[PDB]
Amino acid sequence: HHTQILIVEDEQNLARFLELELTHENYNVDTEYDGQDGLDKALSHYYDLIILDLMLPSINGLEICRKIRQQQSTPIIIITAKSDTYDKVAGLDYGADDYIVKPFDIEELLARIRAILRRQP
Ligand SMILES: [Mg+2]
């Protein structure tokens, strides 16, 4: 009944902050701090939207994005300190629906989540 979000982010302070802020907006949030654990969770459960850090232990977020896209059209937002156009283009072309440079303001993330989920059936 709740919208379900997965966050794969190894900086645990930010992961916890995003979880709290999204929960306050009535999302249900799962978090994983390891890239392999995050991919496994994304493939084994239905999420409405997945948020992926790029520099993660075990598996990089771009590889997580690619493996998810073999199996699912689930919306993905990449969050990362990699701000070069090269990196933005790579993430989007791997299947991400949006790409936000860290550090970012929570209100922008929430607005981009709403914009993406607006179009899902
Ligand atoms: Mg990281």
UniProtKB/Swiss-Prot annotation:
Keyword Cell cycle annotated: no
Example GO molecular function: transcription cis-regulatory region binding
Localization terms from the record: Cytoplasm
Keywords, sorted A to Z: Activator, Cytoplasm, DNA-binding, Phosphoprotein, Repressor, Transcription, Transcription regulation, Two-component regulatory system, Virulence
Keyword Transcription: yes
One GO CC term, this protein: protein-DNA complex
Post-translational modification: Phosphorylated by ArlS.
Modification sites for 4-aspartylphosphate: D53
Source taxon at top rank: Bacteria
The Response regulatory domain, residue ranges: 4-117
Gene Ontology biological-process annotations: regulation of DNA-templated transcription
Function comment: Member of the two-component regulatory system ArlS/ArlR involved in the regulation of adhesion, autolysis, multidrug resistance and virulence.
Protein name per Swiss-Prot or TrEMBL: Response regulator ArlR
Protein species of origin: Staphylococcus aureus (strain bovine RF122 / ET3-1)
